[PDB]
Amino acid sequence: CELCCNPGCAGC
């Protein structure tokens, strides 16, 4: 998620 690797990541 630090790379916004999935659209469900909080913050992305």
PDB file of C-alpha atoms in Angstrom:
ATOM      1  CA  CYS A   1       0.000   0.000   0.000  1.00  0.00           C
ATOM      2  CA  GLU A   2       2.983   2.342   0.318  1.00  0.00           C
ATOM      3  CA  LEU A   3       3.012   2.139  -3.495  1.00  0.00           C
ATOM      4  CA  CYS A   4      -0.794   2.368  -3.781  1.00  0.00           C
ATOM      5  CA  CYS A   5      -0.577  -1.118  -5.224  1.00  0.00           C
ATOM      6  CA  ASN A   6      -4.302  -1.808  -4.809  1.00  0.00           C
ATOM      7  CA  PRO A   7      -7.210   0.684  -5.129  1.00  0.00           C
ATOM      8  CA  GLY A   8      -8.582  -0.468  -1.807  1.00  0.00           C
ATOM      9  CA  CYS A   9      -5.561   0.760   0.094  1.00  0.00           C
ATOM     10  CA  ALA A  10      -6.558   3.357   2.649  1.00  0.00           C
ATOM     11  CA  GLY A  11      -5.247   6.680   1.445  1.00  0.00           C
ATOM     12  CA  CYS A  12      -5.150   5.591  -2.212  1.00  0.00           C
TER      13      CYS A  12
END
